[PDB]
Amino acid sequence: STNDNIKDLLDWYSSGSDTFTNSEVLDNSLGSMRIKNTDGSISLIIFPSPYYSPAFTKGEKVDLNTKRTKKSQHTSEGTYIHFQISGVTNTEKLPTPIELPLKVKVHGKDSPLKYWPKFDKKQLAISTLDFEIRHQLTQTHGLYRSSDKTGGYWKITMNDGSTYQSDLSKKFEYNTEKPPINIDEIKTIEAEIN
Fold this sequence. Notes:
The chain is mainly beta. It folds into 2 domains: 1-17 and 89-194, Ubiquitin-like (UB roll) (Roll), CATH 3.10.20.120; 18-88, CATH 2.40.50.110. 13% of the residues lie in helices and 44% in strands. The chain has 2 helices and 15 strands. The chain has helices at 4-14, 126-140, and strands at residues 18-29, 32-36, 42-46, 61-74, 80-85, 88-89, 93-98, 102-106, 109-111, 119-121, 123-124, 152-158, 163-167, 181-182, 186-193. The chain has a 5-stranded mixed barrel with strand order 1-2-3-5-4. Strand 8 and strand 9 form a beta hairpin.
């Protein structure tokens, strides 16, 4: 039915995500950060974009709404390391949680939402939003499970008119990812499956 590329996408988006709040920056180099999570584990997260280069310094607190690149490890020194990519923002919370205006259209027909979570963070990395949206599409709307649901896009429109969008037939371009956005400044989020 589907082609090998769609199978890669399905595997990536069907899996969950790693979530850690109030993590602390242990080190910040070009393209990566070493973070100590409150539970003890270390997170070594890579940032392949010049447009999104985290400037948090040692000691600063961050939130991780990232995704793992490979299996976690137990090192000889008894440390537990996570290997993730992107998904680092500040710890600012919204006064009250808000539900983002998501509209899905499958083959032109409006498809209702199921289990769409409310958010409480002031800012979320675009990569985080990408998988939240895509995960909803894969688990509730069958995206990537059959050849008749393998294309489309999602578009986020900001209060000021600027838009962000990703092509649902390709993997998210981490390499050119823009900085996290204030979710309370989002006008609409549209997703369409071809």
